[PDB]
Design a protein around this ligand. Structure first.
Ligand SMILES: [Mg+2]
Ligand SMILES: [Mg+2]
Length: 271
């Protein structure tokens, strides 16, 4: 495809209807160096006059999905900074006020970044748990959770086939989320590594439907072709499987139904 528009129309013809976007941003301290090869020895969270990789990912995906929400309200969270670590997420806005389209996700982000202290370690359990509450409170409406991160879930130290506590909770959160009408997209930005990644998806337990997808933003953005086509490939690789998961949610009677056993997660305020 040559534009995001062709991608947008491709989701639409594949059966995609109303879809609410949720964004979670990685604020781990590794973002200082993971831009070594991929972002010219700059911090991934560097704010200049060019968009950094988080800003690019947000822009491309927010644009491709803008058509599927009338109000474009995007619940927007950070995690991995000093206030949250691997335990919580924080709202971009006070009182967990959702963002107005990706453009307010973008502007609000740049305001927030230089007021953080990047921390760690890395778990996606809190952001996934957060998106589950939002889905449940929405009354079972279809959501796409897009997680944008610069590394895989923290594994401190135990080859002999055991899971780190972060891995365990993340994998638990992914499986548990398959009970809801929700698609989870992990976007990998920066140098990574992202090698051990679809061997990770190999150890996610069986689910009613395949609610999880990893996409490597860096890898795509590195190929030798027009900026447009890189952007199209990323949008498509990120989202090509979401219509099929949306249908899955219908055939399992998840949509429009409330689950009843989803604990209410609360977001820390923006720092
Ligand atoms: Mg809406
Ligand atoms: Mg990291």
């Amino acid at each position: 495809y040559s534009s995001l528009e062709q991608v947008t129309e491709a989701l639409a013809r594949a059966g995609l209807e109303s879809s609410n976007l949720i964004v979670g941003i990685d604020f781990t301290k590794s973002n200082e160096w993971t831009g070594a090869r991929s972002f010219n020895r700059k911090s991934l969270h560097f704010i200049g006059s060019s968009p950094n990789p988080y800003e690019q990912a947000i822009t491309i995906i927010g644009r491709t999905l803008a058509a599927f929400d009338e109000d474009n309200l995007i619940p927007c969270y950070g995690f991995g900074d000093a206030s949250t670590h691997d335990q919580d997420v924080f709202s971009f806005n006070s009182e967990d006020r959702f963002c107005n389209g990706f453009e307010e996700v973008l502007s609000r982000y740049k305001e927030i970044v230089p007021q953080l202290k990047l921390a760690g370690p890395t778990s996606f359990a809190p952001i996934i748990d957060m998106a589950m509450t939002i889905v449940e409170q929405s009354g079972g409406q279809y959501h796409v959770l897009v997680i944008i991160a610069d590394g895989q879930v923290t594994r401190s130290v135990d080859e002999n086939g055991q899971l780190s506590p972060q891995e365990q909770k993340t994998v638990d959160a992914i499986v548990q989320a398959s009970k809801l009408p929700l698609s989870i997209v992990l976007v990998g930005v920066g140098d990574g590594p992202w090698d051990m990644m679809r061997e990770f998806d190999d150890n996610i337990p069986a689910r009613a439907f395949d609610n999880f997808q990893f996409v490597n933003f860096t890898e795509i953005m590195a190929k030798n072709k027009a900026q447009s086509l890189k952007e199209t490939e990323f949008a498509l690789s990120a989202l090509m499987e979401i219509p099929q998961q949306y249908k899955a949610t219908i055939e399992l009677n998840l949509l429009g139904r409330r689950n009843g056993y989803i604990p209410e997660r609360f977001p820390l305020p923006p720092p």
